[PDB]
Amino acid sequence: MQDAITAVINSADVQGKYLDGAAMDKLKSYFASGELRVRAASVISANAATIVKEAVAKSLLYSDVTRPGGNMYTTRRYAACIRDLDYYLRYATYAMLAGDASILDERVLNGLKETYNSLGVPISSTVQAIQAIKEVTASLVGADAGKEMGVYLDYICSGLS
Amino acid sequence: MQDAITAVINSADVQGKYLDGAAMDKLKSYFASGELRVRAASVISANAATIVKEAVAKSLLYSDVTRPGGNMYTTRRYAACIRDLDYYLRYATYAMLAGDASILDERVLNGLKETYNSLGVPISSTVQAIQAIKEVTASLVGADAGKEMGVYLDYICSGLS
Amino acid sequence: MQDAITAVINSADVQGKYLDGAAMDKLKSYFASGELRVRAASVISANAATIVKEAVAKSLLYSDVTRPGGNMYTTRRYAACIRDLDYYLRYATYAMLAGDASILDERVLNGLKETYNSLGVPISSTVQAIQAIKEVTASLVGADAGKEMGVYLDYICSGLS
Amino acid sequence: MQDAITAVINSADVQGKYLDGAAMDKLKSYFASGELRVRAASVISANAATIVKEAVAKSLLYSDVTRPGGNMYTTRRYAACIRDLDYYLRYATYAMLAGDASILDERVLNGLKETYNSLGVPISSTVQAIQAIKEVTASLVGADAGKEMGVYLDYICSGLS
Amino acid sequence: WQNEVRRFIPQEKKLTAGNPMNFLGMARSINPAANTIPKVSAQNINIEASVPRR
Amino acid sequence: WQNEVRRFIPQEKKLTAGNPMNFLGMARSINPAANTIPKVSAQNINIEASVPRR
Amino acid sequence: MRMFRITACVPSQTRIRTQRELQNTYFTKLVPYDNWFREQQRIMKMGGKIVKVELATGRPGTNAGLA
Amino acid sequence: SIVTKSIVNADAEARYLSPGELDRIKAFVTGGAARLRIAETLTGSRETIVKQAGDRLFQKRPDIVSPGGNAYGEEMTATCLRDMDYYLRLVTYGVVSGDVTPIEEIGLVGVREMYRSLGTPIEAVAQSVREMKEVASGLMSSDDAAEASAYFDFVIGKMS
Amino acid sequence: SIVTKSIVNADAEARYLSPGELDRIKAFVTGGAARLRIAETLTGSRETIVKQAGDRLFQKRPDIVSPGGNAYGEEMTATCLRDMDYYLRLVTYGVVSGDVTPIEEIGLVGVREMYRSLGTPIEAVAQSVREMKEVASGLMSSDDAAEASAYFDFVIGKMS
Amino acid sequence: SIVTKSIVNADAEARYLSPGELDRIKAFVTGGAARLRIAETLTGSRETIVKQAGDRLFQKRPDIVSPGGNAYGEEMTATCLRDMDYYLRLVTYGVVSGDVTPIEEIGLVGVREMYRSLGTPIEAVAQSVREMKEVASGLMSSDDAAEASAYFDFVIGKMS
Amino acid sequence: SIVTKSIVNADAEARYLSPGELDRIKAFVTGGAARLRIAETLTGSRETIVKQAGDRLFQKRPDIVSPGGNAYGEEMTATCLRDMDYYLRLVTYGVVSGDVTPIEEIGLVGVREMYRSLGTPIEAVAQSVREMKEVASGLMSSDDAAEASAYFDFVIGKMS
Amino acid sequence: SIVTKSIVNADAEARYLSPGELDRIKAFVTGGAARLRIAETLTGSRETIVKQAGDRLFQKRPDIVSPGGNAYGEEMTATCLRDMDYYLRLVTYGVVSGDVTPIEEIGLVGVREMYRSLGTPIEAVAQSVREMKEVASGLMSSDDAAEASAYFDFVIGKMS
Ligand SMILES: *[C@@H](C)[C@H]1/C(=C/c2[nH]c(/C=C3N=C(/C=C4\NC(=O)C(CC)=C4C)C(C)=C\3CCC(=O)O)c(CCC(=O)O)c2C)NC(=O)[C@@H]1C
Ligand SMILES: *[C@@H](C)[C@H]1/C(=C/c2[nH]c(/C=C3N=C(/C=C4\NC(=O)C(CC)=C4C)C(C)=C\3CCC(=O)O)c(CCC(=O)O)c2C)NC(=O)[C@@H]1C
Ligand SMILES: *[C@H](C)[C@H]1/C(=C/c2[nH]c(/C=C3N=C(/C=C4\NC(=O)C(CC)=C4C)C(C)=C\3CCC(=O)O)c(CCC(=O)O)c2C)NC(=O)[C@@H]1C
Ligand SMILES: *[C@H](C)[C@H]1/C(=C/c2[nH]c(/C=C3N=C(/C=C4\NC(=O)C(CC)=C4C)C(C)=C\3CCC(=O)O)c(CCC(=O)O)c2C)NC(=O)[C@@H]1C
Ligand SMILES: *[C@H](C)[C@H]1/C(=C/c2[nH]c(/C=C3N=C(/C=C4\NC(=O)C(CC)=C4C)C(C)=C\3CCC(=O)O)c(CCC(=O)O)c2C)NC(=O)[C@@H]1C
Ligand SMILES: *[C@H](C)[C@H]1/C(=C/c2[nH]c(/C=C3N=C(/C=C4\NC(=O)C(CC)=C4C)C(C)=C\3CCC(=O)O)c(CCC(=O)O)c2C)NC(=O)[C@@H]1C
Ligand SMILES: *[C@H](C)[C@H]1/C(=C/c2[nH]c(/C=C3N=C(/C=C4\NC(=O)C(CC)=C4C)C(C)=C\3CCC(=O)O)c(CCC(=O)O)c2C)NC(=O)[C@@H]1C
Ligand SMILES: *[C@H](C)[C@H]1/C(=C/c2[nH]c(/C=C3N=C(/C=C4\NC(=O)C(CC)=C4C)C(C)=C\3CCC(=O)O)c(CCC(=O)O)c2C)NC(=O)[C@@H]1C
Ligand SMILES: CC1=C(/C=C/C(C)=C/C=C/C(C)=C/C=C/C=C(C)/C=C/C=C(C)/C=C/C2=C(C)C(=O)CCC2(C)C)C(C)(C)CCC1=O
Ligand SMILES: CC1=C(/C=C/C(C)=C/C=C/C(C)=C/C=C/C=C(C)/C=C/C=C(C)/C=C/C2=C(C)C(=O)CCC2(C)C)C(C)(C)CCC1=O
Known part of the structure; x- marks a missing residue:
C-alpha cells in the first residue's frame, strides 16, 4: 500500500529524481495534517464499536434485510455484517492516517465486487451503511477529520459502486 | 505433455495401430537428430546463466526499460525478469531435447500473456529479450542447433506476443 | 466533455449549491486566461501543419523507428504517425481553449493505450514525440501559453504512459 | 456496357443463335487490334497526368477561360476542370481498351451536357481542351492509336456539344 | 592480459538497412551539381505583360 | 542566403537520470587508481605449506 | 451500370419537422438497377409517389453487357 | 468479356x-484465335454434344423422363433438349x-427462381450440363478441353 | 461575410x-470603418507588399526562381507575383x-489540386503568404495588422 | 501478388x-521464371541503376539540390538515393x-502525406522513378523490359 | 514509511x-522538519558525496576497477557512480x-540476484555504502549523522 | 552413483x-573401465592441470591476486590451488x-554460502573450473572429452 509520505517518494522515483521543493512542501503538508490524522484515528479507535452500532441502527435495522429471509437474517449473517462494517471503518481509518487511499483498493476493494455478487449482498445497502458510518464519525471526530474520513469512505463506496 | 516420440506413439495409438512406415521414418528422423539435440542441451546447461546474462546485457540492459519508470527498475523486478528468462531458457531446452512445443504451451503460454498484463509487463520488451536469448544461444550451440533454438524461442515469443 | 466553466457548473450542481466565492474566482481566472488561450489557439492553428514537421524531425527522423523493421516504416505507418501527432496537437489545442483535461480523458486517452499495445506501436517513442512537440509548440506559443500547452501535452503522455 | 466482344455476343443472342461468320470476322478484327489496344493503354497510363497537364497548359492556361470571369477561375473551379479532364482521359482509355463507346456514354456522358449547361460551362472551351488532350495522346501513343483515341474523344465532344 | 571494457553506449554500430550512410559516400561519387545562386531582382518585374497572355 | 543542411544523425535523445552518461565525466573526474598486473605464476607455489594452516 | 433516374415527392406523415426538408421531400436521384426495386418499394411504403423515372444509364433490352 | 471485367474493376478504383x-488483356487477345477455334468446334457439332448429353442424363436420371416427370413426354423432352442447347450456346x-x-x-441470374416456377430439379440440369461437358x-482436343471445361x-x- | 456565416450557422439549427x-454583427457593422481603412491600406501598397514579399520568399527559397524550379524564366516569377497579388486581394x-x-x-477550395497540376511547391506558397503577412x-498600424493577421x-x- | 487480390475479390463477392x-493465376505461375529472373537482374544491378537514375534526375532538375532545396545537404542527396533504393525494392x-x-x-499508400510532411515534391520522385525505368x-532484355517498364x-x- | 509500517503491523493483528x-507517529510527524532538512543536506552534497565516496571506495578496493574487476574503465566506474547515486537516493x-x-x-529485494547476475562483489557495494556513511x-551534525547513519x-x- | 539415483526413484515410485x-546401470557397469581410466588420468596429472588452469584463471582475472583480492598473498593463492584441487578431486x-x-x-550444495562467507568471487571459480575443463x-582423449565436459x-x- 501507499501513503501520503511514500506517495511523494514513488512519484519522484518513477522519473528517478531526488526530492525537490514540491516534494518537500508535500511532505510538510502531510506532517501538518498528521496532528489531526492521529487525533481522529485515536478517537475513532476508541469509539469504533459504538460508531458501527449507531450506523447500523439508522441504516439497516428494522428493514427488509433484517426481517426473515433477508440477508441480515440468520444471526451469523448479522455478525458478518457487523464484522464487515468494522473492517470498512478500520481500513478507512488506516487510509486516513496514511493520507492515501491505496490501502483501500489493495486490502478492501480488491475482489469485493464479485464477493458481494456471489454472496448476493445488497451492494447499495452496504453503501448506505458506509455513508451512515461516515455521518456518524464526522459528527464525533470534528469537521476536518470527518472530512478526510468521509473522503476515504466515499472512495470505498465508489469502488463498491 | 508430449514430444515427437510420444507424438508418433499417441498418433498411432489413437487409431489403435502399430508403428506404420510413416511413424517408422519420423522416428528415424528424430533419432537422426539425436546426439545433436542432447549435445546442444548439455552446452546450454553449461553456461546456463551466461545466455541470460548477455541477453540482458544486449537488449534490456542500459535503457529506459531498466531505468526509472521502466518495468526493469528496482532490484526486485530485475531479479524477477532474470527468473523469467531462466524459466524461458530451461523450458526451451526441455522442448528442444523433447523436440516438441507441447511443454512450452502447457507450462508457459497458458495465462502468461494475461499474467503479464495483470502485472503490466512489456510484452514487446520480453519479445526482444527472448530474441537476444536466441543469438546468445546460437553463438554457443552452433548453427543448426542454434536454428532450432531460434525456432522454439520464436514459438515462445509468438505465444507470448 | 466539459470546459472550465461547465466543469465548475457541474461541480456546483453535484452539491446542489450556488456559485460561491471559489466558483466566481475560478470563473474569473478562466476569463482572464481566455485572451491568452484564444491568441495561442490562433498561433497554433497557424502552424499546426508545419509544427508537427519539426516536432517529428527532431524526435522520430533517421532513427530506429523510421527504418525498415521499425514501427514507423512504410507510408501507412509514417502517415498514421504524423496523423496521430496532428490529432494530439488539435485535441490539446481544444483542451487549451476549454482549459480542462476532460476532453482528453474520453476523446483521446480513452482506449488509446491498449489500442497502441494491440497495434504494437512503441508507446515510449510516442511519449518522446509528444515531449518534442511540447517544446516545438512552446517555442511558437510563448512561455505562459507554452506552459499551458505543455501541461495538457504531459497529461496526454501520462495517460499514454 | 458493350465492348467489341459483348456487343457481338448480345447481337447474336438477341437473335438467339451461335457465332456466325460475321461475328467471327469482327471478333478476329478486335483480336488483331488488341495488341495495339494494350500498348496504347500502357502508353496513356504511363503519362496519365501529363497529357491533361500540357492540354490545359496549351488550350486553357493564360486565357479568359482562367482569367477573372472565366468559368475556370478560382481554385475549386480549376480543380473541377482538371478532374473533369482526368475523367475524360481515363474513360477514353477505357473505351479504347473495350473497343466501344458504350461505357463512354454509360458512365461519363450521363447528363453531362445538361449539367454543364446548367452550370454555364463553356462548351467550346471544353471541346478545345478535349482536342488538346487528343493531339497530346496521339503524339505519345502513335498515329493509329492517336486516331482511335480521337474517335472516342470526338464521341465525348459530340455528346457534350 | 586485459578486460573488454564493458560498453553501455552502443559504439561501432554497422550501417544497417535504412541508414542513408550507405549512400552518402556514393552520393560523394555522384557529387550532385548544386545549381548556382540565382540572381533574380523580384522588384523591377512590371507585372502587366510579363504574365503570358496565351 | 544561409541554408540549414540537416545531417544524417537523428537528434540526440536528451540525457535522463537513469543513464550513467551524466556520471561519465564524473568517472573521468574520479580517475580511479587502477592496479598493476600481478606478476605471480603459481608454479613455484607448492600446496603443502603455502596454503594457510592455523 | 444501367442506372435509373427518379424524381419523386415523399412527404412526412408522422412528424412535423422544423428543419428544411426539400432535399429529402421532392428529389431527383440516380438509383442502381439492382436497388431500384427496393427503393421503389420503400418509397411506396412511406407514402412517397414516384413522379417520374427513366433509364438514365444503360440501354433497355440488353441481354448481356450489363455490369 | 474479360476486358469488360477489367475496366469494371479499374473504374471501381477510378484508375487505369x-x-x-x-497482362490479362494481352494474353486474351493473343489466345483469341484458339478460343474462337474452340467455340467454332463446339458450335459445329453442337447438335451432337447436346444430344449425347441429354441421352446420358436420361440414363443417369430416369425419373426425369419417368411418368409424372417434368420432362416426361416427347414435348417436355424437346423442351429440356432446347434448354441444353441454350446452355451450350451460353x-x-x-x-x-x-x-x-x-x-x-x-x-x-435467377435461374433457381425460374426453375422453381417451372418446378425443375435443377440438380438434374447440373448433371445434364456435366454430361454436355x-x-x-x-x-x-485435350488442351482445348481444359478451357472449355472451365466454363462448362x-x-x-453456379447451377449445381 | 460574418453576416452570411452567422446566417448559415443559425440555419444549421433553425434558430433566429x-x-x-x-451583438457580433452589430459590432462588426459599427467598427467596419477600421476594416475598410485596412482595406485601403493594403490596396494602395499592394505592389510593394507583394514585391518584397516575393523578395523574402526567394531569399529563403530560391528553388522556384532557379532554372530547375517552377518559377524560372522571369515569366513564371511574374506568375508568382500575380498569384500573390490574387491572394492579397482575397x-x-x-x-x-x-x-x-x-x-x-x-x-x-481545391488549391492543392490546383498546385499539384502545376508542380508548384505549395509549401513555398505558404511561406510567401507568410512573408506577405x-x-x-x-x-x-499594429492592431490593424493584428486584425488582418487573422485572415493572412x-x-x-489552409494553404498548408 | 495476383492471387492475393484475386482471392480478396472472390471473397468480397462470396464466390469461388x-x-x-x-487462368490469370495459371499464366502467372507458368511464367514466374521470367519474373524471378527480373528480380535477380534488378537486385544485382541496384548500384549502377540507382546511380544513373539519380544522376539524370539531378541533371534534369537541379532545383532538388539547388540553394534552399530539400536536398541541398550532402546528406540529403544520400537520403534521396535511399528513397530511390526503397522504390527500386518495391x-x-x-x-x-x-x-x-x-x-x-x-x-x-499515403506517400503524398509523406512528401507534404517532408516537403519533397511528388513530381520529382516521379521523374526519378521514370529515370529508373x-x-x-x-x-x-526487351521482352522483360516490357513488363518492367509496365510496372514502372x-x-x-499512380504516384504522379 | 513508519506510518505504512504501523498500518501493516496493525493489519496483521486486525486491530486499530x-x-x-x-504517539510514535505523533513524534515522527512533529520532528519531521529535521528529517526533511537532513534529506535536503544529503541531496545537496550529492555530486560531492558520490565523488569522494567512490574515490575512497576505489582506494580501499581497487580490484573492482583493476584488471579483472567488474568496473575497469571510466565507463563502468560511471556505472558504479550511477548505482552509487541510486542508493544515495534510496x-x-x-x-x-x-x-x-x-x-x-x-x-x-533480490539484490543478491542482481549482483550475482552482474558479477559485482556485493561486499564492495557494502563498503561503498559504508563510505557513504x-x-x-x-x-x-553528529545527531543528524546518527539519524542518517541508521538508514546507511x-x-x-542488507548488503552483507 | 546412478545406481543409487535409480534406486531412489524406484523407491519413490514404490516399484521395482x-x-x-x-539398461542405465548395465551401460554404466559395462563402461566402467573408461570412467576408471579417466579417474586415473586425472589423479596422475592433477598437479599440472590444476596449476595450468590456475595460471589461466590468473591471466583472465588478475584482480583476484592483486593487492587486495581474496587470492592475494601466497597463502591466499595456495588456497586457490587447494580449492581447485578439491574441485578436481570432486x-x-x-x-x-x-x-x-x-x-x-x-x-x-551450500557452496554459495561458503564463498559469500569467505568473500570469494564465485564467478571467478566458475572461470577456474572452465579452465580446468x-x-x-x-x-x-577426444571421445572421453564429451564425458568429462558433461560433468565440468x-x-x-550449478556453481556459476
Ligand atoms: C427483551 C426481551 C430483550 C431484548 C430484545 C431486543 N431485540 C432488539 C432488536 C433486534 N433483535 C434482533 C434479533 C434477531 N434477528 C435475527 O435474524 C435473529 C434470528 C435469526 C435474531 C435473534 C435483531 C436483528 C434486532 C435489530 C433489528 C430488527 O429489530 O429488525 C431490540 C431493540 C433494539 C433497538 O435498539 O432497537 C430489543 C429490545 N433486549 C433486551 O435487553 C432483552 C434481553
Ligand atoms: C531526391 C531527388 C528526392 C527527395 C528525397 C528525399 N527524401 C527525404 C526523406 C525521406 N524519404 C523517405 C522515404 C520513404 N519512407 C518509406 O517508408 C518509403 C518506402 C516504403 C519511402 C520512399 C523517408 C522515410 C524520409 C525521412 C527519413 C529518411 O531520409 O529515410 C529527404 C529529406 C527531406 C527533408 O526535409 O527531411 C529528401 C530530400 N526529395 C525530393 O525533392 C526528390 C523527389
Ligand atoms: C560499483 C562501485 C560496483 C559495481 C556496480 C555496477 N553496477 C552495474 C550495472 C547495473 N547496476 C544496476 C542496478 C540497479 N538498477 C536499478 O534500477 C536498481 C534500483 C534503483 C539497482 C540496484 C543495473 C540495473 C545495472 C545494469 C546497467 C543499467 O543500469 O542499465 C555495473 C556495470 C555492469 C556491466 O557489465 O555493464 C557495475 C560495475 N560493480 C562493482 O564491481 C563495484 C563494487
Ligand atoms: C523479463 C523477460 C521481462 C520483465 C518481466 C517481469 N515479470 C515480472 C513478474 C513475474 N513474471 C512471472 C513469470 C512467469 N509466470 C509463469 O507462470 C511463467 C511460466 C513458468 C513465467 C515465465 C511471474 C510468476 C511473476 C510474478 C512473481 C514473481 O515476482 O516471481 C515482473 C515484475 C512485476 C511486478 O513488479 O509486479 C517483471 C518486470 N520485465 C522486463 O523488463 C523484461 C522485458
Ligand atoms: C507516431 C508518433 C507513432 C506511430 C503512429 C502510428 N499509429 C498507427 C495507427 C493508429 N493510430 C491510432 C490512433 C488514433 N486514432 C484516432 O482516431 C485517435 C483519437 C484521438 C487516435 C489517438 C489508431 C486508432 C490507429 C489504428 C488505425 C490506423 O491505421 O490508423 C500506426 C499504424 C499501425 C499499423 O499497424 O498500420 C502508426 C505507425 N508509430 C510510431 O512508431 C510512432 C511512435
Ligand atoms: C509562386 C511563388 C509559386 C508558384 C506559382 C505559380 N502559379 C502559376 C500559375 C497559375 N496559378 C493560377 C491560379 C490561381 N492563382 C491565384 O492566385 C488564384 C486565385 C484564387 C488562382 C485560382 C493560374 C490560373 C495560373 C496560370 C494558368 C492559367 O492561366 O490558367 C505559375 C505558372 C504556371 C505555368 O505553367 O505558367 C506559377 C509559377 N509556383 C512555384 O513554384 C512557387 C512556389
Ligand atoms: C474543364 C475541362 C472545363 C470545366 C469544368 C467544370 N466542371 C464543373 C462541374 C462539374 N463537372 C461535372 C462533371 C462530371 N462529374 C463526374 O463525376 C463525371 C463523370 C465521372 C463528370 C463528367 C459535374 C458533375 C460537375 C458539377 C458537380 C461538381 O462539382 O463535381 C465546373 C464547376 C462549375 C461550377 O459552377 O462550380 C467546371 C469549371 N470548365 C471549363 O471552362 C472547362 C472547359
Ligand atoms: C399553410 C398555410 C398552407 C399549406 C401548407 C402545407 N405544407 C405542407 C408540407 C410541406 N411544406 C413544405 C415546405 C417547405 N419545407 C422546407 O423546408 C421549406 C424551405 C425552408 C419549405 C418552403 C414541405 C417540404 C412539405 C412536405 C414535407 C413536410 O411537411 O415535412 C403541408 C402538408 C401536406 C401533407 O398532406 O403532408 C401543408 C398543409 N397548405 C395549405 O392548404 C395552406 C395554404
Ligand atoms: C402421367 C402424367 C399425367 C398424365 C396422365 C394421363 C395420361 C391422364 C389421362 C387419363 C385419360 C386418358 C382420361 C380419359 C378419360 C375419358 C373419359 C372420362 C371419357 C369418358 C367418356 C364418356 C362417359 C362418353 C360416353 C359416351 C356417351 C355418353 C355417348 O354420348 C355415346 C358414346 C360415348 C362412348 C362417347 C399428368 C398430366 C397428370 C402429369 C404428368 C404425367 O407424367
Ligand atoms: C594490500 C592489502 C592489505 C595490506 C596492506 C598492508 C601491507 C598494510 C601494512 C602497512 C604497514 C607495513 C604499516 C606499517 C606501520 C608501522 C608503524 C605505524 C610503526 C611505527 C613505528 C614507530 C612510530 C616507532 C618509532 C620508534 C620509537 C618510538 C622508539 O622508541 C625508537 C625507535 C623506533 C623506530 C622503534 C590489506 C590487509 C589491508 C587488505 C588485503 C590486501 O591485499
Missing part, C-alpha cells in the same frame, strides 16, 4: 488498369468472351 | 440568430467581408 | 475463383509477385 | 493502531519516509 | 527398477560414480 489487367458465348460474365447475365471434351464447370457449379 | 451572434476581400468564407470560396504587419494566417493554415 | 482469375517486389499489391502496400530498360509506368502514374 | 504506534527516501521499507521496496556523517547502516547490513 | 533404469569422484550426486553434496580436454559443464552451471 494495373499491370495484371493489361458456354460458347463465355468461351469467346473470355470470362463468365455473359453466362451469369444470360442464364445464371464430357461429350464436348470427348470430341475436342463454372456453369455446373 | 440568437443575441450572442447579433485577404482584402476577407477583411472587408468580416470572415474567411470568401477566401475559401475563391482561392482555398509580415510585410503587411510592418505596414499596418487563415490563408497560411 | 472465376475461370478468368484462375518495384522488384511487385515484379516478383506478378502484381502491384506490394508496391501500393509498402510505398504508395529508363535505365532498367536499357540494362534489361504503374508506379510513376 | 495502538497508542504506542499513534537512503534519502528512507530518511524522509522515516522507515526502511521503501528501501526494501526499491534496492534491497563515513563521509556523509563527516559533512553533517541498514543498507550496509 | 524399470527397464530404462536396468570431478574425479563424480566420473567414477556416473552421476553428479557427490559433486552436488560435497562441494555444490579446457586443460582436461587437452590432456585427455554441470559443475560450472
